[PDB]
Task: structure prediction
Amino acid sequence: GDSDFVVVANRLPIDLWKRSPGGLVTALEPLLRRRRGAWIGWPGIPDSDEDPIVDGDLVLYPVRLSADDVAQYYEGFSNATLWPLYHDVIVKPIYNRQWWERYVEVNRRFAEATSRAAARGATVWVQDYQLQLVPKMLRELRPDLTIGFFLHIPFPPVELFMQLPWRTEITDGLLGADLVGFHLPGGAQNFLFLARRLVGANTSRASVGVRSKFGEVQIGSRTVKVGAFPISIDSADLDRQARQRSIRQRARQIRAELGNPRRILLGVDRLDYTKGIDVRLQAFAELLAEGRVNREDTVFVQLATPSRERVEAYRLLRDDIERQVGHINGEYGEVGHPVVHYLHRPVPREELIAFFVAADVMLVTPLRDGMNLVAKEYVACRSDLGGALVLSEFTGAAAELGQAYLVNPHNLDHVKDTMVAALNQTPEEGRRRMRALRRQVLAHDVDLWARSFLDALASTR
Amino acid sequence: GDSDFVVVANRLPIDLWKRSPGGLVTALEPLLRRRRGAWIGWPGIPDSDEDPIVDGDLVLYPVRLSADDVAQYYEGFSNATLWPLYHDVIVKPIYNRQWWERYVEVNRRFAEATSRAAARGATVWVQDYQLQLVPKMLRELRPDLTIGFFLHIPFPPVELFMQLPWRTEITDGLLGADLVGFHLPGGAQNFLFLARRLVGANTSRASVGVRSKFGEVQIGSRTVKVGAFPISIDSADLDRQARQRSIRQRARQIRAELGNPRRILLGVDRLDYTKGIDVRLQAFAELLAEGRVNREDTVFVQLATPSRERVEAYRLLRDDIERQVGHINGEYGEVGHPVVHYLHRPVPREELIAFFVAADVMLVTPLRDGMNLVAKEYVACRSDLGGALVLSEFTGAAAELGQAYLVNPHNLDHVKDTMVAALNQTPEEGRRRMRALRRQVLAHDVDLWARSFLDALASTR
Amino acid sequence: GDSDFVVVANRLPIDLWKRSPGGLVTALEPLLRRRRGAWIGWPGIPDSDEDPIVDGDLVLYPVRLSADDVAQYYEGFSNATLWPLYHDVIVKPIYNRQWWERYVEVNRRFAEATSRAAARGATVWVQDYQLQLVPKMLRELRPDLTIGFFLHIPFPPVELFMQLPWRTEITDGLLGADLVGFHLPGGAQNFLFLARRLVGANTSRASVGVRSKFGEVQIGSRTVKVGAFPISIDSADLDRQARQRSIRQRARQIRAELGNPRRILLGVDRLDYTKGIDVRLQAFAELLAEGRVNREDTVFVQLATPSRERVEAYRLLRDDIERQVGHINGEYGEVGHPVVHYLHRPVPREELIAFFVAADVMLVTPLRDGMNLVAKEYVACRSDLGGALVLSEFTGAAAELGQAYLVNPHNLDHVKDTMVAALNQTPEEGRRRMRALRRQVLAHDVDLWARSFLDALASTR
Amino acid sequence: GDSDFVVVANRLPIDLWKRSPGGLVTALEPLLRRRRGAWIGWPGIPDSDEDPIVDGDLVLYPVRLSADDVAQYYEGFSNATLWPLYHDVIVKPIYNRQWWERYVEVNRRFAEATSRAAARGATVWVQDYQLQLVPKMLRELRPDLTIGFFLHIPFPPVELFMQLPWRTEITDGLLGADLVGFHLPGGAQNFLFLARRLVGANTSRASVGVRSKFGEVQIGSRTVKVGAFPISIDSADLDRQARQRSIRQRARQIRAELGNPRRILLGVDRLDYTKGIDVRLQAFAELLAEGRVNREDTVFVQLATPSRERVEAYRLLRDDIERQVGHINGEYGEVGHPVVHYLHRPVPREELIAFFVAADVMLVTPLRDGMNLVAKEYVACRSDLGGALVLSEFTGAAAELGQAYLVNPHNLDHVKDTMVAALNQTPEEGRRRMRALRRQVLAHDVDLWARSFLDALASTR
Ligand SMILES: Nc1nc(=O)c2ncn([C@@H]3O[C@H](COP(=O)(O)OP(=O)(O)O[C@H]4O[C@H](CO)[C@@H](O)[C@H](O)[C@H]4O)[C@@H](O)[C@H]3O)c2[nH]1
Ligand SMILES: Nc1nc(=O)c2ncn([C@@H]3O[C@H](COP(=O)(O)OP(=O)(O)O[C@H]4O[C@H](CO)[C@@H](O)[C@H](O)[C@H]4O)[C@@H](O)[C@H]3O)c2[nH]1
Ligand SMILES: Nc1nc(=O)c2ncn([C@@H]3O[C@H](COP(=O)(O)OP(=O)(O)O[C@H]4O[C@H](CO)[C@@H](O)[C@H](O)[C@H]4O)[C@@H](O)[C@H]3O)c2[nH]1
Ligand SMILES: Nc1nc(=O)c2ncn([C@@H]3O[C@H](COP(=O)(O)OP(=O)(O)O[C@H]4O[C@H](CO)[C@@H](O)[C@H](O)[C@H]4O)[C@@H](O)[C@H]3O)c2[nH]1
Result:
């Protein structure tokens, strides 16, 4: 094709159609103004055509997937094999050969679509865990290409990764890239060690820096660069949006509809067993039982956005959470006044922002998370410097947001102590922490992240 | 002793102490004004003395039970063997010989306490399923006594009753009475048939009437009378209480705290798998899913009062209900506005009455219930003639309250159609039904019930 | 059509084809020698033709059923609604409207096939619980027909039957017959009472006899006869077969292959939660634990023939039984010598007979069973007068086989005492019981049963 | 005290008393001949005295533990917190503060007993995961002591270890030793990294060798040596024992009692979810289903020795295994001939050896195991060079026994292919592998292991 910069991701950046706002596609916008850019991905509808769609600023190359392809490659291998394994086997991975075979077939299809789109010597950026085979496949089809890969989820320790029957094929797949990136040095280091242990490659031995001090894996003639690039958000855009009059009015109205509580705790997560939602509810229930939280003036709002309903583990998790909600309200609420409000539905963006602005305490307690953007979005929204962020150590965000109230979600006693501390912090201490968090998040945004990855990738030429 | 009228029940009519209001003890009040009355029962505290406590109007004979006695006789045999069996094995009965043996021992202890209290030729009224052995034991100790027994729960069909390894001992136990009473002719008829089948006794063959047309079982020289006496409430007292200014004000305030819904559905139950609470929640959820109930102006309040937490079946039921609550609100509620309010705690009497007065639809949907007094209490409270009663056929109350919206709780389609009908009834049709229900309940109260049983018992002399 | 005697049953009497041996079709053989006989049923293959197949002695009228029809009418309504309900809700019935609707449609299809086959004034005999609507449907299409119906499973008490949302349609369905038969007087009496209670029909009030003293239900102009006819086997044929040299040799070989135990206990059941297989295993395990059975010279063989694998309750039951087997052998067996041998597969007829002949104790312990033919087959096989039958009271067979060791399967203590008694009986006592059981079974065979039902049906003309 | 060499372990080396044969205490025997040796541990009985017991060759210092101490320190913290966590969270660890507190208290008690026994400047060797706090505690009480610690179970990756709320206290605890040893370089390397990440200590960065190329952690003034020392058995003793006439006769008799199969597969494990017993049964069942194993001449014997019955996870595992056994025999066995023989009981040593000698295929398929001595015992027993070892990669043994048939137990397809390969290997190929395995195991025995650890520990002086 005629594209000199190509993004490859599981989905096209569109909504059933119009171009989806925010996210990655928006971060790459000023680069697409200087490159002939293409995006390869599944359009979210089964058995579509693979004819290029030109969005003026971007050419879209759709990948044809059947509903069966999605079930086995995505719902199956990606979400029920790789996802639990890479997140410290919080649930038991399912190892299924038919899923693996479809994962391979689908990955090859993405590689072929990429080759179609990519001009000679083009730069290719492959995204995330569903497409780990693409770099090697693409290099085999197109050795002229410069290929980066970024993993948006954690890379597990070798002891767990080795369970995968197709461990070598996945590792070889990633090693097809010129640059392999992770959010954290820890992931990068796991990858280097895996390369020595499983593949027998020569690697660098030093610690991996942040956006610097890169690792290397020697693969025959070529070197694979390995780095840590912690993703972020468009901090300035969110900061601006959260100041809008209508947002502030909605935040006030939200507190009124809750019966004007003195304190609001907020959870916002795509529903997932990685997110530690059960831990928040348990801590909140025990604090109420112990009379350490006032059931008359404190309320917890949990917004869970629907996710992967076709995967049994997620249905079971939804059942457990919903029981806890029912239980806590039955024990500590009053008719007309729950202590927990729980919604299981997508939330409009401006509604989400209003909740961030209304919340006195943001509860972000994942058991394991690659980064977690919600923690950073909350911070970017609190230009009033109010609020408090309670944040699990087991998120990538915790490496940057050390001024938050950090918790080990497995240490329930300390999660409880910490929620009480956040609820009762002095105004001045709250401001001190929020000012420091905002300096970090405003300076380290999605633009810095993308530039850093692309600079590293360009240097491999 | 010196008491010529003696009530025997699992518990003394007191609260940890003061005499408990309402109920049986209040219905017998004008009889105790003419008799030397006694009450035998456990005082609700472990390992107490058995020394008589004179309440001027009544002498209380406490029965000493250890916490272990309560666990095996009551929590065990009564609540985990007899209770599920007599209620159509909604949950699997547990047959345990140690429980049976303690049930026997405890029953003998009640029989001994009774004999102590009862004067020569005295009238004795034994209450309910925990004390089914007492009549035979008492007749053996004291053949001079006139003994009635009333079962407050259903008497199961013979096919189920026969499962009980101690079926003959229980049947013989009841046959020790001069009069055996049930709420319904159906129970009485089951008992007659059981007497022929299991014991080989000669019995009457005709249908058993209501408070009349009694059955008989011939036991050697003596005849056991068998009858149906449907319990009720103090209708006039509740009717009066519900008109109080403070109650009406609270009912208005309740609707305001719910965000002034157009329609309130109400469930009030001691928590129990017999009560069909899960069925109401399922019906309500499906109606919301189908858009047949308006999620913006209709709300369901379920008040579940704690019961038998030491019994695993009840903990599991509580878990299922609480999941449904969480689920329904997550799907159809809004932050600040649940469609289901659920409380798991005792409710003050005047608060309960305010809820009856506030509720547009009373949901009483047991899978199986001896009578269900809540259905009658709601009716007695609605002197404004507003409201609507949705009532399971599988309650004793359904035999008297035919003007209610009757449902087969297993017929979920019809339960749903019926809830929509009740919510949308014309004012005039609602009044017609409520007027008819009140005529029944006001005329057939707990005083008529008690008089009828005691007249029948006196006639056995 | 031109058939003056027509049998209607869920399946044709054939095997995927050849005419299936034994059973009903063999009992009717000398009647088909005098009548133009027809058989209506599903041929066991999906979407077949409905063209008559003449077997010289019989005309076969196949009913076309799709795999979906079978799933909803049979696997669904028959096996997951009616079956658990009629067997004292050992598992929870599922009430599903789509299943009911297919059950109706399929029943009408059987009725139409019947009408096609049946000559004017013909006698029709409809079999069993899958076809309860057929008599009324058939009478509506063909008021000239004489119609009998026999239920091969128990008829539940009214308290349970009333759960069925389509209770009235089923009752009306059965009332379409001239004669409704059950194995036991108890079923007949339940039906009479149901007729009064649900339908408001006038019925007889006396006890129902065995093959005599029939009940009646008055339905407008016509009377429905109600009777008890306990099914049996071809006792003489089995008695003869069990004496064959090859059978006796196999029985000896079976004992040798088991390591020549002193005592063999045997269970033979179509796998079903009604059969009380779990109870036998529990009793056997506790006896071994208590050292009351000798683990060195006593062995239990359980033959479970596969049944209804598409129904979840049966898969769960299979899992529980298989755990008990594994557990008991792990605890009390030796390598090379299990104390329990368990097979889950169909057994050839002559192999089954050899096991009957080898077994010292036959364990037939259903929680609830219409008759249970295995109990009678064992007896018919023991012309040597050896062996012992342990038999649940909750089978129809227990009403005729009172000389067996009868047990309440819920009374585990007594089941255990009884198994020890059977294992250790004197030769003379064993013979006394087996002689008496054989007199009953040899005199009361399937020929007496069929004649009695057909005589009763003929008398309705 | 007066002991210059002291072993500290959870239990004394005795049996309820007499000195237990084999194991560690036997390996140290020629060292105790030159040192004043002591052993500190719990005597296995609750609330005993702590008075020294002199065994002439050894002084025993008993530690007083109550049954409650054992429940919280051992059954609780050791077996339900540490054990699952260190074994790649195959089951979910339970984090309980009361368990942690008892673990601390008990560890301090072991430290005090040690100090009592240990002479000035004595050498102390602390054993295993129940006693990880002892080295730091002991160094604080007795800075004169030389302290080694060896972990017999895996040391998990940092991502999992970090879950532990008391992660720092455990790490500091181990860092109290002069020498910290693991079976594998991988564990040692995890420990070094943990030291940098959690404690901020300076460590060596190179790979850790086997019994050489040691790692180091700098802790203030002192250096902690870190090493890999793979445990083994008394290879020569077992080799000798397995040649005994009575053992060989028993092995022949075992095959006869199994009905002289052509092939015997054997599993021998302390029952534990780490052991992958479920995987063997699944593979065996699928091979039978596929007809790839002959159900007529191949038999699988699984010997599971009882373990940790008070821990719920182990009861659930026992239930799953026992179901699989029952299921497989019901499907593929015959009466008198199971395809799986399963025993849940301790086996005498000489019986175990006879089974090793009888087995054509040894199935050692743990999901995760520190070493696994059963794999090495089998090899040492096969001086006839017959047999075949199927061995999980996820055992420490797999690093030394590469000539075995290695499998990824999560790769069920390959486990199945491998079992077929082992069952059908040529005699010559079997001998080649067994000869090579025996050279390794005979040369690398428990004496080499103990000498190597003690030499490393002595060098820290
Ligand atoms: N408009 C709107 N309505 C909702 O209802 C709504 N609900 C949520 N959101 C927004 O979605 C995003 C969720 O961000 P995550 O951090 O949870 O990312 P993941 O989905 O888990 O996916 C991976 O990739 C990320 C980036 O690399 C990593 O952080 C993760 O660790 C990694 O798992 C946030 O921005 C949030 O605000 C909504 N947005
Ligand atoms: N004050 C107050 N606070 C509460 O929270 C509160 N919560 C409930 N209640 C009152 O308790 C009574 C419950 O009546 P039930 O009908 O449910 O009776 P059971 O407890 O099930 O016991 C048996 O005996 C009865 C009589 O024979 C039969 O009807 C039953 O079928 C039979 O099972 C009602 O009156 C109700 O209003 C409260 N009252
Ligand atoms: N050849 C062969 N191989 C096997 O593997 C094999 N396995 C079993 N059998 C034979 O099947 C028959 C099972 O008889 P049931 O009594 O259990 O009858 P159900 O199947 O439950 O069906 C209903 O109808 C019966 C008659 O009215 C009632 O007794 C029942 O109560 C009622 O539920 C016996 O004859 C037995 O020997 C095999 N026969
Ligand atoms: N006599 C007798 N009767 C039995 O019934 C009987 N049943 C088993 N055994 C013997 O017990 C020993 C079990 O050895 P393991 O390797 O399984 O060790 P663990 O118990 O899991 O404990 C840890 O420490 C070991 C050494 O560091 C590591 O290998 C382990 O990875 C690690 O978990 C073997 O020797 C075996 O033969 C019996 N012995």
About this structure: The pocket of GDP-alpha-D-glucose (ligand 2) is lined by residues B 152-153, 231, 270, 305, 346-347, 349, 352, 369-374, 377 (CB under 6 Å). Chain C has two domains: 1-234+444-461, 235-443. Residues 1-234+444-461 of chain C form one domain.
